[PDB]
Short mmCIF file of C-alpha atoms and ligand atoms in Angstrom, two decimals:
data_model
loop_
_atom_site.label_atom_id
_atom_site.label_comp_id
_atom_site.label_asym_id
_atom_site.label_seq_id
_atom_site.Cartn_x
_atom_site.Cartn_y
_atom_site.Cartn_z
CA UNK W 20 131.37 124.05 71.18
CA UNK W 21 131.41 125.17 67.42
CA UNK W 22 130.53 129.31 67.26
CA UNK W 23 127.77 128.39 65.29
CA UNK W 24 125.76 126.56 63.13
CA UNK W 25 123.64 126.79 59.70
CA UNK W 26 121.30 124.59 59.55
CA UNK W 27 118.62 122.65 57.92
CA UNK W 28 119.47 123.57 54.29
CA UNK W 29 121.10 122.20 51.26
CA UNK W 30 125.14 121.69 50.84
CA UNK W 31 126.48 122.01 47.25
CA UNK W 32 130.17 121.34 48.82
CA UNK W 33 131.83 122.63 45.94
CA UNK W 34 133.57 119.45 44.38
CA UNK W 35 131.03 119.06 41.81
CA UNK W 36 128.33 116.99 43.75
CA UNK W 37 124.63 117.14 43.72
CA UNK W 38 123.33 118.86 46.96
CA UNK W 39 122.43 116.95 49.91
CA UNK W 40 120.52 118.07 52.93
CA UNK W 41 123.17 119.20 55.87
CA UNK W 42 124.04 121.59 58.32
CA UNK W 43 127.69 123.27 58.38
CA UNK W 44 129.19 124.22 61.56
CA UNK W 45 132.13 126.57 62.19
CA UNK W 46 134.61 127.17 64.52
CA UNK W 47 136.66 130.26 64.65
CA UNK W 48 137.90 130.06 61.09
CA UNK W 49 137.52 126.94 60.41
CA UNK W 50 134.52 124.62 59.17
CA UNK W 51 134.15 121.99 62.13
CA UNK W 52 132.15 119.31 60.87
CA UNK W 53 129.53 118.35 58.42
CA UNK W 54 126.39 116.22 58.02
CA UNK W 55 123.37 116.03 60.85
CA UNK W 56 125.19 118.31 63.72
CA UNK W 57 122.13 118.07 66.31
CA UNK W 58 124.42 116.19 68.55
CA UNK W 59 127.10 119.03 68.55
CA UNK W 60 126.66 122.00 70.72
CA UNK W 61 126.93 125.20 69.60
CA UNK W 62 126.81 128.93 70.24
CA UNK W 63 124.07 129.38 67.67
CA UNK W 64 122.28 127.84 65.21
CA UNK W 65 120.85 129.61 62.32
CA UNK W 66 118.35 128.84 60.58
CA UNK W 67 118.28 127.95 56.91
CA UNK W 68 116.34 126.08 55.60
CA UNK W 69 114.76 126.48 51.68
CA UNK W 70 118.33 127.85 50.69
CA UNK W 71 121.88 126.40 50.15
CA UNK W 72 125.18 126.61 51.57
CA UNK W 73 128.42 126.67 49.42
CA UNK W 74 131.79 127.50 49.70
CA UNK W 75 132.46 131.36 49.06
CA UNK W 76 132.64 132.65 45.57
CA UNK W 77 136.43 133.27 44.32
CA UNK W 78 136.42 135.52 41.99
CA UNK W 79 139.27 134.46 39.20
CA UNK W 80 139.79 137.84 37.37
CA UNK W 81 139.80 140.96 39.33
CA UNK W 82 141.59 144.39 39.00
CA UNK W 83 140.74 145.20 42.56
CA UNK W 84 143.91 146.05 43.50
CA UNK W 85 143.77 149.01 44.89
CA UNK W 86 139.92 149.05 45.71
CA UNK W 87 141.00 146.73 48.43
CA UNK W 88 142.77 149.70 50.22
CA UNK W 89 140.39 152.22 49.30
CA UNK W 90 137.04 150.83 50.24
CA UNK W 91 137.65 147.88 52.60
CA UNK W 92 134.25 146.93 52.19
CA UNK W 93 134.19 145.40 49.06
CA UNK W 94 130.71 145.59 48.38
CA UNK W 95 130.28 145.48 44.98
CA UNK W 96 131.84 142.05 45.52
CA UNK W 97 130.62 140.61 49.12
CA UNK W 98 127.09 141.53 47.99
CA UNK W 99 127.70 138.83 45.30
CA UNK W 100 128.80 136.35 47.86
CA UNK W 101 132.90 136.89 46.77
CA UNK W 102 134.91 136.20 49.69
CA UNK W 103 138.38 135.93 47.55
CA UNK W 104 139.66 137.81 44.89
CA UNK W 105 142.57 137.12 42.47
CA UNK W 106 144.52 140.58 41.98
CA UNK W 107 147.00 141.75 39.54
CA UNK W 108 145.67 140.75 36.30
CA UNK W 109 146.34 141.34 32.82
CA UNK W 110 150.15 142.78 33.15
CA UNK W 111 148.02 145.59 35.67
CA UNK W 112 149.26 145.49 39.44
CA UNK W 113 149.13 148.06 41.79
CA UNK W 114 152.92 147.55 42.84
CA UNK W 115 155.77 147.84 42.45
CA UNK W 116 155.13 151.09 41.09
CA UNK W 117 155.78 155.11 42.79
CA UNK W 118 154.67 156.92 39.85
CA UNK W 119 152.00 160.19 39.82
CA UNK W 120 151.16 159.31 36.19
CA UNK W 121 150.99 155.73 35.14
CA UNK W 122 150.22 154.95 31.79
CA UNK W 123 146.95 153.46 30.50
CA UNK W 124 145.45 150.89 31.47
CA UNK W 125 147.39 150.85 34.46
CA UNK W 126 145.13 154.07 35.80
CA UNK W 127 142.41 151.73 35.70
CA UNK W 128 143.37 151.37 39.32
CA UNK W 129 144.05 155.02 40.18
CA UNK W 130 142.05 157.28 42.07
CA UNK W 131 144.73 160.15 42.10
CA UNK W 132 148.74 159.52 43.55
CA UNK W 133 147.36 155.97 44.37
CA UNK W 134 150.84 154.14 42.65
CA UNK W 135 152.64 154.85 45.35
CA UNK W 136 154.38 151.38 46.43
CA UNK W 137 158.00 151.18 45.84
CA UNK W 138 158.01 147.28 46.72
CA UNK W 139 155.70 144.54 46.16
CA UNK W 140 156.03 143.93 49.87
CA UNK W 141 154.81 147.43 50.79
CA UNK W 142 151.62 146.36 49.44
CA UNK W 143 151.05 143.53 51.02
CA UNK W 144 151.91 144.94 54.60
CA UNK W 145 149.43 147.55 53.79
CA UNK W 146 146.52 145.07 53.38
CA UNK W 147 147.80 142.86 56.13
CA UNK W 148 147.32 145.82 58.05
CA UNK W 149 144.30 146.82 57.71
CA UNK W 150 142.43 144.05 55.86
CA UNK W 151 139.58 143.92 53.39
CA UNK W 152 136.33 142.37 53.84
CA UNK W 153 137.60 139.16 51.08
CA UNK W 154 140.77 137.41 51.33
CA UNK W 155 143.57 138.85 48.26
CA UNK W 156 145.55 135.99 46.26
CA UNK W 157 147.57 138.86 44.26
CA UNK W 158 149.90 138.51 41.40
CA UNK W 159 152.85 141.07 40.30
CA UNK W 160 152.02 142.88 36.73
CA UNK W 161 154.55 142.29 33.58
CA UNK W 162 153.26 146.30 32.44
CA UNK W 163 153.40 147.65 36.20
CA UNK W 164 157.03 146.29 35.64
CA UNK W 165 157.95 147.71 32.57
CA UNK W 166 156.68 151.02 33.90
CA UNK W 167 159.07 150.66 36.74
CA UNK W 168 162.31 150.17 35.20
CA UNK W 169 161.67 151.07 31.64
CA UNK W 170 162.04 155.17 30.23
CA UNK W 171 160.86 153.85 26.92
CA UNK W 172 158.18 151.75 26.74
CA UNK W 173 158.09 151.70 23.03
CA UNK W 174 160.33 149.12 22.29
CA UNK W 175 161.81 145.71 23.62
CA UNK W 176 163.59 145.40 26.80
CA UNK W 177 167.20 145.40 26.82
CA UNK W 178 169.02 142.83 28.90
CA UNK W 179 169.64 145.30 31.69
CA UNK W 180 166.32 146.16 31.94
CA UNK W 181 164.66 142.65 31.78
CA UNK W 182 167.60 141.90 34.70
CA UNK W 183 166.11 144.70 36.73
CA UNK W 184 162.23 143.64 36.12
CA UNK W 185 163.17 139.70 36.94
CA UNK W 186 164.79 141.26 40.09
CA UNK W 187 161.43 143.10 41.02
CA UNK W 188 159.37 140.02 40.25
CA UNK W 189 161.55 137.69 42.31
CA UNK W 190 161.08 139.56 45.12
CA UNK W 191 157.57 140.01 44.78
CA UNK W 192 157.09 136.33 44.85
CA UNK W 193 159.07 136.03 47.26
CA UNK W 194 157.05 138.43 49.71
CA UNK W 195 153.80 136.37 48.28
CA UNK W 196 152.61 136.77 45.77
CA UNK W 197 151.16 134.07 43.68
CA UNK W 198 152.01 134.93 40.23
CA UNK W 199 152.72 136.47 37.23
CA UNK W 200 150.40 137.91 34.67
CA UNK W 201 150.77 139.64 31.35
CA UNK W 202 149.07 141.82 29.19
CA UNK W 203 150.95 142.51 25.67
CA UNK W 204 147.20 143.73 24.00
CA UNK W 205 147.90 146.77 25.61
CA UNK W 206 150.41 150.17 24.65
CA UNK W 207 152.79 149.47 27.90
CA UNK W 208 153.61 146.26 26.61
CA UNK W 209 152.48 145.76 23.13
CA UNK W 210 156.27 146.07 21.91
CA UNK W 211 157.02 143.08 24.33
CA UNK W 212 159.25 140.11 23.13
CA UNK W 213 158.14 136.59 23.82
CA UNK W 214 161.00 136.02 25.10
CA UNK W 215 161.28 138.69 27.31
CA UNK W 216 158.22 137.36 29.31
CA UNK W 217 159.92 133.96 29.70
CA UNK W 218 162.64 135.99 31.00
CA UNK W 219 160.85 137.94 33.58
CA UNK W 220 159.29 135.15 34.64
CA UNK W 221 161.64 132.71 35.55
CA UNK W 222 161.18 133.22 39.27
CA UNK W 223 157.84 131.20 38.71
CA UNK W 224 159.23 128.02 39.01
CA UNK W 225 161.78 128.32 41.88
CA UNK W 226 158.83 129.84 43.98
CA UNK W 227 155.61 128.15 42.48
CA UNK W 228 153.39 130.63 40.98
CA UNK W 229 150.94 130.72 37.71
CA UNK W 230 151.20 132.62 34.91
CA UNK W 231 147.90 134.22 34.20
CA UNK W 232 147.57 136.12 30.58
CA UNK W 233 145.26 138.99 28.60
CA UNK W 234 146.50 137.42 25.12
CA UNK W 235 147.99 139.57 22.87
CA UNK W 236 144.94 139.67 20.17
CA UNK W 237 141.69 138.30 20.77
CA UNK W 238 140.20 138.02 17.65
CA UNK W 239 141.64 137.67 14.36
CA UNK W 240 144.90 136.82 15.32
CA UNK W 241 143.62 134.94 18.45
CA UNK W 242 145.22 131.57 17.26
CA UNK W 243 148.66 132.83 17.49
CA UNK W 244 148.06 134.37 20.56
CA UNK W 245 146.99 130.89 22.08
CA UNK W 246 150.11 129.48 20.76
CA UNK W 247 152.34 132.51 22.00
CA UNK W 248 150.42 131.29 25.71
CA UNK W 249 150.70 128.00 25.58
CA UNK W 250 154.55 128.24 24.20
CA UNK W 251 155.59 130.34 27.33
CA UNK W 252 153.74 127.75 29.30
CA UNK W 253 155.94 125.01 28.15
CA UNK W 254 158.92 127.13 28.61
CA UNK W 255 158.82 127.79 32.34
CA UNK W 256 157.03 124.68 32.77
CA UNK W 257 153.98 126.48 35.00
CA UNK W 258 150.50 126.40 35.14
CA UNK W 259 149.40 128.96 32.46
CA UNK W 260 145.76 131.10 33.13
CA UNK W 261 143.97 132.30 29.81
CA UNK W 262 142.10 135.22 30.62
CA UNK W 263 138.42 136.29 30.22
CA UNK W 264 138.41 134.14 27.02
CA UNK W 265 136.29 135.26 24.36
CA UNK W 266 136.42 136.01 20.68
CA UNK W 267 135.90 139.55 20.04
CA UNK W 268 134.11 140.98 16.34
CA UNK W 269 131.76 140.25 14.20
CA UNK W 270 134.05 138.22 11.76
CA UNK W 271 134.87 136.10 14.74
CA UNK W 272 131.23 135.27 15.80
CA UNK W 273 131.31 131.26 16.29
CA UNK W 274 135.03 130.58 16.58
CA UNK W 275 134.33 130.06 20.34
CA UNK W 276 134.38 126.14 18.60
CA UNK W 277 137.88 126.45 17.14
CA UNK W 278 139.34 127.89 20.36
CA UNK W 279 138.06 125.34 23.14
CA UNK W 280 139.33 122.90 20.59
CA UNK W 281 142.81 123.85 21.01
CA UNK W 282 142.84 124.90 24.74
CA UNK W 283 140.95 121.32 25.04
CA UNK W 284 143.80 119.65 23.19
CA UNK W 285 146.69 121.72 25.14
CA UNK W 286 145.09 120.52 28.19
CA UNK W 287 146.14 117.31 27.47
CA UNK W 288 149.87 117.60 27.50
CA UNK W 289 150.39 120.82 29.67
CA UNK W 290 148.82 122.37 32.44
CA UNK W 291 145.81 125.18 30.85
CA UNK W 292 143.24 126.91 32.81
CA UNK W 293 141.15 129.52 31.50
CA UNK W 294 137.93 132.15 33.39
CA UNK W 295 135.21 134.51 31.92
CA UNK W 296 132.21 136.59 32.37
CA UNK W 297 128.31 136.15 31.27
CA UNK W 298 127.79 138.80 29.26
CA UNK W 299 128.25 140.05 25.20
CA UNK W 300 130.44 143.66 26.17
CA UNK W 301 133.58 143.92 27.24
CA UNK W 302 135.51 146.77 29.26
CA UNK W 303 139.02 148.27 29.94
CA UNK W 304 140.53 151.82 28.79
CA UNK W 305 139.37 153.61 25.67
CA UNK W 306 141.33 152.50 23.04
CA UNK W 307 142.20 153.45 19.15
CA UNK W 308 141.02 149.58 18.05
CA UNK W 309 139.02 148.90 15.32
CA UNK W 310 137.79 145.86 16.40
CA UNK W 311 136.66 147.18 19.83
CA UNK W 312 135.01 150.28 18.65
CA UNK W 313 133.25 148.34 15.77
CA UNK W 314 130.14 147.89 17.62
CA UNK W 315 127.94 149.93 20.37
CA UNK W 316 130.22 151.59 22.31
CA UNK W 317 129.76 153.72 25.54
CA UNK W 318 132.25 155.90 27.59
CA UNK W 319 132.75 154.77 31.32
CA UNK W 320 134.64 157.44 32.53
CA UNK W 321 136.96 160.28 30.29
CA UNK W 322 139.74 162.90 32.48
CA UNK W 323 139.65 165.30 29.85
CA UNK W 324 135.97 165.86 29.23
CA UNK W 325 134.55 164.30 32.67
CA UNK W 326 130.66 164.82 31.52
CA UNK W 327 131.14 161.94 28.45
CA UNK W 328 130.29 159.10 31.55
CA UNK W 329 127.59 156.96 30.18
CA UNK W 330 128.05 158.53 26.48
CA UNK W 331 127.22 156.37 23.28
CA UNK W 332 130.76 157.17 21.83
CA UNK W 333 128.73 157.25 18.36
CA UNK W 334 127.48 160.77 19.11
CA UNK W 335 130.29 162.15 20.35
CA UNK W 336 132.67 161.45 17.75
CA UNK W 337 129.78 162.19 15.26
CA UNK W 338 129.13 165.70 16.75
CA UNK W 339 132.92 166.42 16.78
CA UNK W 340 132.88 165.69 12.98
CA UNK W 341 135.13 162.42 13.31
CA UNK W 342 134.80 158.83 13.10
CA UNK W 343 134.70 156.93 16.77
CA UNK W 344 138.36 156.10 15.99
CA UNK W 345 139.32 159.40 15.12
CA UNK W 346 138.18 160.79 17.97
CA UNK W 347 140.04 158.57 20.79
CA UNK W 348 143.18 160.67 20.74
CA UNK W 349 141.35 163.84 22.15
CA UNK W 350 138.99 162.02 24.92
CA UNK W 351 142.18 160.86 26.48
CA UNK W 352 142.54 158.90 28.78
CA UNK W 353 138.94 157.38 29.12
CA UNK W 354 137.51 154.12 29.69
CA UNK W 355 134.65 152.25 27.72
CA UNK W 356 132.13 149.49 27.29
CA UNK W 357 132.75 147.59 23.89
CA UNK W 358 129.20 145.75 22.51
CA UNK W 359 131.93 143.04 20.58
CA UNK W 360 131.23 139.50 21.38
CA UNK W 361 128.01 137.17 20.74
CA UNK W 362 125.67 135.26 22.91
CA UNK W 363 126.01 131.89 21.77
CA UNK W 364 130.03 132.23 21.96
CA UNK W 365 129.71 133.44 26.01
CA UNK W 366 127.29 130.75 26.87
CA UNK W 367 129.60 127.72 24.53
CA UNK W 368 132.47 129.01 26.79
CA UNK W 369 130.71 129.22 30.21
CA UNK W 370 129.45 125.79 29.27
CA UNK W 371 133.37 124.63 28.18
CA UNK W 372 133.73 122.26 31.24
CA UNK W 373 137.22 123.51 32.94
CA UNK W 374 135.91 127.61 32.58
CA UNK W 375 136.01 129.21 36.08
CA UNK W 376 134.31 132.54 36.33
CA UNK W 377 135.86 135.73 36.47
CA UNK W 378 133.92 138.99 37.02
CA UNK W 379 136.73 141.53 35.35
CA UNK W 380 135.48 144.14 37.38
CA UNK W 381 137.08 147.94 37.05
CA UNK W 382 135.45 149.16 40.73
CA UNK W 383 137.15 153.02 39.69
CA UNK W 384 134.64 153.62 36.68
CA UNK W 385 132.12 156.30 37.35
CA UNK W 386 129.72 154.23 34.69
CA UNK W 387 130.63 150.61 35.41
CA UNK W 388 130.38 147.44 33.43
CA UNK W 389 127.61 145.43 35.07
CA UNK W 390 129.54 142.31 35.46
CA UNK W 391 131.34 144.39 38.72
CA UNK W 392 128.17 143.70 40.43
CA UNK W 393 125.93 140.72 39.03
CA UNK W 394 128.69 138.13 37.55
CA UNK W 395 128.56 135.23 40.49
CA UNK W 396 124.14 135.49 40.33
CA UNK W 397 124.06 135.72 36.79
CA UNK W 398 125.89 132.82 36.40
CA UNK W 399 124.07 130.52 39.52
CA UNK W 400 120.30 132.38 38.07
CA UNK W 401 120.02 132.65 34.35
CA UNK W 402 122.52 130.77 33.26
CA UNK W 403 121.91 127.07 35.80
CA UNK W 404 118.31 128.06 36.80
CA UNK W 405 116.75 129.57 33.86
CA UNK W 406 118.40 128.67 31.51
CA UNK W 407 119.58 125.07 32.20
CA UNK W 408 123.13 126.24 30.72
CA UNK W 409 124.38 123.57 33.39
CA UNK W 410 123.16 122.06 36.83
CA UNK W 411 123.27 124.35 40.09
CA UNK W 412 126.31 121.79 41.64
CA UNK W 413 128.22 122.75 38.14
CA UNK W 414 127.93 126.43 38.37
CA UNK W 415 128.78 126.58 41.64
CA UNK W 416 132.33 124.24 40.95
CA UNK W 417 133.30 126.87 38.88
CA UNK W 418 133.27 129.74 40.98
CA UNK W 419 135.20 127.81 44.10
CA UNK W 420 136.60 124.19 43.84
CA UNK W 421 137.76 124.47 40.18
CA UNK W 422 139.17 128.30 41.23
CA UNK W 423 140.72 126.88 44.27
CA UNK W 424 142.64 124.04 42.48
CA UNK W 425 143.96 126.43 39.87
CA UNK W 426 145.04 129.07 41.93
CA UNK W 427 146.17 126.76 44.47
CA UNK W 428 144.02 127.99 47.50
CA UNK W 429 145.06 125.74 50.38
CA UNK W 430 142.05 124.59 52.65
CA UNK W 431 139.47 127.04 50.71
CA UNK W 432 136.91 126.50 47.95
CA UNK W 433 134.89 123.68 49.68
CA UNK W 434 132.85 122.65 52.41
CA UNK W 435 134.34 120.01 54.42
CA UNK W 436 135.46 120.19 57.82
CA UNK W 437 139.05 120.83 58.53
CA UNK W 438 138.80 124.27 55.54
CA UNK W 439 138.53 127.42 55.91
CA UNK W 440 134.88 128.92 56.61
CA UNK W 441 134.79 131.08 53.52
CA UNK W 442 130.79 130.52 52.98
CA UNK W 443 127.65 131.72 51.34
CA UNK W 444 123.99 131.34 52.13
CA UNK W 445 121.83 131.75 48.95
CA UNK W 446 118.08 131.18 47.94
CA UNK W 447 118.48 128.88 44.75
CA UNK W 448 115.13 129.74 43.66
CA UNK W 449 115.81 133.77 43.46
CA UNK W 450 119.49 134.00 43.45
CA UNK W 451 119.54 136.65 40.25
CA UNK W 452 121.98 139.44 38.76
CA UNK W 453 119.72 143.10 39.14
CA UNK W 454 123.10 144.64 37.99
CA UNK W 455 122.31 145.45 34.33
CA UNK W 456 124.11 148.20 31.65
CA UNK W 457 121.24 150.82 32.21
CA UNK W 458 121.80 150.43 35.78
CA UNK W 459 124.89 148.36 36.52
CA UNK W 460 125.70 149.09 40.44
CA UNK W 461 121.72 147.55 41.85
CA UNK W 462 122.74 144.60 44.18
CA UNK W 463 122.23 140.69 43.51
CA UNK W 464 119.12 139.22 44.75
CA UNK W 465 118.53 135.63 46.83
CA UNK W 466 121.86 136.35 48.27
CA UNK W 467 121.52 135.84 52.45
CA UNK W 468 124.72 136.15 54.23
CA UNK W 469 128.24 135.32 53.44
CA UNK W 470 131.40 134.37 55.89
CA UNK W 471 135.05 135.06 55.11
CA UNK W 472 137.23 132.98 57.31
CA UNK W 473 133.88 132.38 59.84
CA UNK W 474 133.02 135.90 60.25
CA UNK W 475 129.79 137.32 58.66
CA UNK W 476 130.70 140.27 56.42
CA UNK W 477 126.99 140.86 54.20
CA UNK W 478 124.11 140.01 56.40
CA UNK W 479 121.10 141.69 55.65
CA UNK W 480 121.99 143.53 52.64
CA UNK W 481 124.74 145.38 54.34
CA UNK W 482 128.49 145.22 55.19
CA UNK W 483 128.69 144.05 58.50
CA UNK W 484 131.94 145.95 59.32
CA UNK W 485 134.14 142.76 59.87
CA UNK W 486 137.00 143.09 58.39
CA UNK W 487 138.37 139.52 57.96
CA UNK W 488 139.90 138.94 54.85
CA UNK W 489 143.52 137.90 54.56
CA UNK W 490 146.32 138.05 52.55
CA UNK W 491 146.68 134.35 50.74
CA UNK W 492 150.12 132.22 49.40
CA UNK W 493 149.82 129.67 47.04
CU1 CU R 1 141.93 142.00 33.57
ZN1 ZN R 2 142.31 141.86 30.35
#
């Protein structure tokens, strides 16, 4: 007898389909069958009809690394109808790494002496141990790296050191995780070789992992760093994962065109994936960048000066007598919201046929980017329903088959029988992002219930207190 069954409402399977009329029924973990079930007993059988069932949301670009220890619940993500999240992004893991003071942006995961994993493996005992509400598919950090071995960060590597920080990634693959990722845009690594990223990591293609990648320049230089990418690609001869792809100032507005044309073109000779948010502002530490602080920017969080959360930067440098980029130095470190990318460029690369969605989430920051909580709605709401940006069956592909496939998810990211029961029940008609910038943590709307390996974790607009997430191997 299956545990249960949904029934009477749509299936949008998540291989790119039109919905069809069927009920889903689960056993254990597992999705048992498919199709008219009224012949199959069951425990239960829930009813719903007017909504849809999909696979669960995977969400491609998250720094909840250490969130997942912290607050097991996950809300800000279940309530969205996550049930997977890809860690480690960006060069920014939580291990290896015992260190009281990491360096920006790795705090962007601390809460205060929360780097305190001396192996990769650590980490992943801890979670196994007492497990989030979402499954984890986490990747080792190039910067969390440096910061390990490294007493200068300033400069390149020298061969010892890249021999120690191969040595650390090695092992961290070999304890599971499922890649690499990089982040050279930022101080820890911004003195980086290209070559010494191909040399840390080699272990990729004796154990099987992706490369995932925050280029080293999004805007003006954003060609080169899409040929840096794709070079190290061809190098190790991996799957390579662009980043929360965008292109970032004013005198960049529009080249959304130029870019999908080459990551189109690289598709066809190498293997190139690539994720991203629905919305015009960006997020991540406070930073002295021109580019970044050329538009609307407001504080997130600041250590020395505490009461700047939610701040338009603009008055506070203004009132200290300096210009915004003066004035980084003494508000650090801080985090920020960066007003730096245009509306017709975010909805050209949602459209972009291969982009999975990432939410880019920092779960630490006292005044959050939006996106933490309304990314998955936004996308299946105002983007497929109200705006037509693409059908429903599309939106959802790209938030679990296509994810799946990249990441290489065994058994998850659709709804046939024999996979995992990572599900979500969702009104197609409401489903909406409330999330917005003047109020960024107010939870999704239309969303039902959602099941992580065929337990319920948000039913009735509340964690449930199952706590079935697991760690995942590619
Ligand atoms: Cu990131
Ligand atoms: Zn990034």
């Amino acid at each position: 007898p299956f545990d249960y069954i949904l029934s009477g409402g749509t299936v949008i399977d998540g291989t790119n389909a039109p919905g069809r009329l069927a009920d889903v029924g689960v056993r254990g973990d597992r999705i048992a069958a498919v199709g008219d079930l009224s012949a199959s007993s069951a425990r239960r059988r829930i009813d719903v009809a007017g909504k849809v069932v999909s696979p669960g949301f995977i969400d491609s670009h998250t720094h909840d690394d250490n969130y997942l220890l912290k607050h097991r619940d996950m809300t800000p993500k279940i309530s969205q109808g996550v049930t997977t999240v890809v860690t480690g992004n960006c060069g920014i893991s939580l291990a290896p790494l015992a260190h009281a003071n990491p360096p920006a942006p790795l705090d962007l995961l601390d809460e205060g002496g929360s780097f305190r994993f001396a192996r990769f493996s650590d980490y992943l005992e801890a979670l196994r141990a007492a497990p989030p509400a979402v499954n984890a598919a986490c990747m080792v950090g190039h910067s969390t790296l440096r910061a390990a071995v490294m007493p200068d960060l300033r400069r390149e590597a020298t061969a010892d050191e890249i021999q120690a920080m191969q040595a650390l990634a090695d092992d961290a693959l070999a304890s599971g995780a499922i890649g690499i990722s990089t982040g050279a845009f930022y101080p820890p690594a911004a003195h980086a070789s290209t070559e010494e990223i191909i040399e840390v990591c080699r272990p990729l293609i004796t154990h099987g992992g992706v490369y995932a990648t925050h280029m080293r320049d999004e805007g003006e230089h954003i060609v080169q760093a899409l040929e840096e990418t794709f070079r190290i690609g061809r190098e190790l001869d991996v799957p390579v994962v662009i980043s929360h792809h965008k292109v970032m100032g004013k005198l960049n507005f529009g080249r959304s065109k130029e870019t999908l044309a080459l990551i189109e073109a690289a598709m066809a000779s190498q293997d190139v994936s690539l994720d991203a948010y629905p919305y015009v502002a960006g997020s991540t530490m406070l930073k002295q960048d021109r580019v970044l602080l050329a538009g609307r920017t407001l504080i997130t969080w600041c250590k020395p000066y505490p009461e700047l959360s939610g701040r338009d930067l603009e008055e506070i440098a203004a009132e200290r007598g300096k210009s915004k980029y003066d004035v980084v130095p003494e508000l650090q470190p801080a985090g920020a919201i960066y007003f730096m990318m245009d509306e017709p460029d975010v909805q050209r690369i949602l459209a972009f046929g291969p982009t999975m969605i990432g939410s880019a989430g920092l779960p630490h920051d006292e005044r959050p980017h939006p996106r933490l909580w309304g990314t998955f709605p936004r996308v299946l709401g105002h983007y497929s329903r109200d705006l037509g940006l693409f059908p429903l069956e599309t939106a959802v592909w790209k938030m679990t088959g296509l994810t799946a496939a990249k990441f290489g998810l065994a058994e998850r990211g659709q709804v046939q029988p024999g996979y995992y029961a990572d599900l979500v029940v969702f009104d197609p008609a409401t489903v909406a992002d409330s999330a917005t910038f003047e109020h960024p943590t107010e939870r999704a709307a239309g969303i039902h219930s959602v099941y992580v390996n065929g337990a319920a974790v948000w039913e009735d607009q509340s964690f449930t207190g199952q706590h079935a997430g697991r760690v995942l191997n590619r």
